[PDB]
């Protein structure tokens, strides 16, 4: 092997420029992509929140028109997706992996415009779900676009320029650069075989991507949090306590977003309008929520800073928690555009302040803040279930900026993954994979 | 890196008095204070604590208001206030920064001190 | 409340000795802390998390104990180190300080 490794290492990372030229327009288009999904989806929660407005005394003609704005853009969404593009439902994560693998297709011509309209209808509506698994899924079919566009040949520019799409399309829908590349190493790279997936590709096409984001929202972050303080060696055990109970629950929710799939689609086996019909009364609830409570409903990002700076009590926070694990799984098991990411985020957050605000009360000793615990949770579903902590820590930290607590966050998210794996549980974007390869050979 | 308290001085029995701690030389936000007394010729004593967004205050087991902790991070000012004073709080105030090695917190940088007498 | 005890109130001891006091408490704590209190003068940090020293105290003091049994020791006391040294635990809240042991100087 001696002779074959000395060639190799003599000739390694020599990425072909033609790869690379790609890459920079690679990401360019999915910014401006992911930019202006964005920039939609603001667009109808304000007509929605500014239609309130006109109605703002009949109290019973007010919950309705929330409700009928949101079901009537629920609807869009499900049929655009059932009608003219079905592998566009639901996040879009598993069939990027399933087009890494060579085992699912790119329907660039379908998936683009489905997704990006079905997405400003179901996220607009203020639906339960993220700007993530649109945009992710969006990047890819728009570097597959380009492959095509310019003919350029090979397995690695067609699996280098499919990442460096789906890289900077999670990196323009957190501003999360770093966490943007760590995706593709760690979760959507074929994960039983090596690949020539250009690194040096996939990172030119998130600074491009980035920089698009960067000219249409600086000045501004989705989360603000403050700088909490810091984390004592003595503290770190409970770091890892909450990791086991992330460890444990973790699976049980990958259980019930797997189960409740199979539970609506016995609602309207497979009909274009018996579904069409329910996923606008779904979308029409989380309208209607959005306003009644409005922490039950959206994306969730509203109510992490509310959260961290300890302004919930520990009701509350049992309530948020368990109304968001029931509006979650509906948004996303209905099969809706849109990503679960996100509406897990605010998913460890409610349940790190729940932990935090225990702690502060049996341990005055430590002098402790729940913020601390909640930035610790944040990231902790996403390494429970979809099982990423790489990618999850460095995103969470990306975001909140407060790396003091680096080594809390390293812990729970540890004890989760670990616990996880202990307790059979399974990376749920390839527990979706594994079922929707399984229906393609049946 | 300074504390410098004051506002001590007479009160009569049970009155009530403000003292006060001004920081200078650190962030003072980021930094939990706490107040420490001793009585002429006695040992340490505990008074009280609160971390810096003043969400957080606790005391030694003292009554409705005996004590009462504030502070102005706008003005690096913190603040203790005794009522219904008897001869027990006629001690000196040390005004403290709190801080921690391992996680066990000990009194980091005291300040001077600052003398109440309670007395007609 | 950990009620701590600091063993002789006060002692007395000749340059070149080597001076001990203890400090014991009522229940379990751990990572105590000592200050030195000298006349007319704010008490001041001197030993923490049992055996560490705050950066400038001389090299001459030690701190050790566990459980009940907590001591600091001066190996070849100096004259300037007369004062009188008070430990204190958090390792259970409220913190609670001992009642000094005064070290007398013999010239």
């Known amino acids: 092997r001696r002779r074959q490794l000395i060639r190799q290492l003599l000739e390694r990372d020599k990425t072909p420029l033609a790869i690379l030229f790609m890459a920079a327009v690679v990401g360019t288009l999915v910014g401006l992509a992911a930019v202006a999904f964005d920039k939609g989806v603001a667009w109808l929660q304000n007509q929605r929140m500014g239609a309130l407005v006109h109605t703002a005394d009949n109290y019973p003609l007010l919950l309705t028109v929330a409700f009928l704005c949101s079901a009537v853009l629920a609807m869009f969404g499900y049929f655009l997706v059932r009608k003219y593009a079905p592998e566009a439902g639901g996040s879009g994560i598993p069939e990027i992996e399933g087009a890494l693998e060579d085992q699912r297709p790119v329907r660039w011509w379908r998936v683009l415009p489905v997704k990006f309209f079905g997405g400003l209808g179901t996220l607009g509506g203020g639906m339960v779900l993220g700007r993530n698994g649109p945009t992710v899924q969006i990047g890819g079919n728009i570097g597959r676009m380009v492959l095509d566009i310019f003919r350029l040949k090979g397995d690695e520019a067609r699996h280098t320029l499919l990442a460096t799409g789906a890289a900077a399309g999670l990196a323009a829908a957190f501003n999360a650069p770093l966490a943007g590349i760590l995706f593709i190493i760690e979760e959507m790279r074929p994960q039983f075989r090596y690949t020539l997936i250009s690194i040096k590709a996939v990172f030119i096409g998130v600074i491009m991507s980035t920089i698009m984001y960067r000219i249409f929202n600086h000045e501004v972050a989705l989360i603000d949090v403050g700088k909490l303080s810091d984390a004592p060696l003595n503290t770190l055990w409970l770091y890892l306590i909450l990791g086991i109970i992330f460890g444990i629950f973790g699976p049980i929710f990958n259980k019930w977003v797997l189960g409740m799939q199979d539970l609506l689609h016995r609602v309207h086996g497979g009909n274009i309008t018996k579904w069409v019909l329910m996923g606008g009364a779904i979308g029409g609830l989380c309208g209607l929520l959005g306003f009644v409570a409005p922490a039950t409903s959206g994306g969730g990002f509203n109510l992490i800073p509310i959260a961290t700076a300890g302004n919930f009590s520990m009701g509350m926070l049992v309530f948020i928690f368990v109304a968001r694990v029931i509006t979650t799984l509906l948004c996303f098991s209905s099969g809706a555009p849109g990503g679960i990411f996100a509406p897990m985020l605010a998913l460890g957050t409610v349940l790190g302040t729940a932990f935090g605000m225990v702690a502060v009360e049996l341990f005055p000793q430590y002098h402790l803040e729940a913020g601390t615990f909640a930035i610790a949770g944040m990231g902790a579903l996403l390494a429970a279930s979809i099982r990423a902590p790489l990618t999850g820590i460095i995103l969470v930290l990306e975001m909140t900026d407060n790396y003091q607590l680096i080594l809390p966050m390293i812990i729970t998210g540890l004890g989760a993954t670990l616990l996880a794996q202990f307790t059979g549980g399974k990376p749920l974007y390839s527990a979706i994979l594994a079922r929707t390869l399984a229906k393609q050979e049946a | 890196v300074r504390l410098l308290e004051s506002g001590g001085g007479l009160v009569q029995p049970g009155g009530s008095l403000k003292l006060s701690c001004a920081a200078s030389?650190?962030?003072?936000?980021?930094?939990?204070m706490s107040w420490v007394r001793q009585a002429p010729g006695k040992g340490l004593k505990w008074i009280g604590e609160?971390?810096?967004?003043?969400?957080?205050?606790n005391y030694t087991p003292s009554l409705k208001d005996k004590f009462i902790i504030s502070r102005d991070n706008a003005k690096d000012t913190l603040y203790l206030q005794i009522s219904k004073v008897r001869s027990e709080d006629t001690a000196l105030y040390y005004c403290?920064?709190?801080?921690?090695?391992?996680?066990?917190?000990?009194?980091?940088?005291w300040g001077a001190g600052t003398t109440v007498t309670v007395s007609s | 409340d950990i009620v701590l005890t600091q063993s002789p109130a006060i002692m007395s001891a000749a340059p070149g000795d080597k001076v001990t006091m203890t400090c014991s408490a009522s229940?379990?704590?751990?990572?105590i802390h000592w200050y030195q209190q000298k006349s007319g003068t704010s008490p001041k940090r001197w030993i923490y998390?049992?055996?560490k020293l705050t950066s400038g105290v001389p090299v001459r003091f030690s701190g050790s104990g566990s459980g009940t049994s907590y001591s600091l020791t001066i190996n070849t006391m100096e004259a300037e180190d007369a004062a009188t040294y008070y430990c204190?635990?958090?390792?259970?809240?409220?913190?609670?300080f001992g009642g000094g042991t005064k070290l007398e100087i013999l010239r």
């Open positions: 403290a920064r709190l801080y921690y090695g391992y996680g066990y917190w000990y009194f980091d940088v």
């Open positions: 030389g650190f962030d003072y936000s980021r930094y939990w």
């Open positions: 609160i971390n810096p967004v003043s969400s957080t205050i």
């Open positions: 229940s379990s704590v751990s990572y």
């Open positions: 998390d049992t055996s």
């Open positions: 204190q635990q958090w390792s259970s809240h409220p913190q609670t």
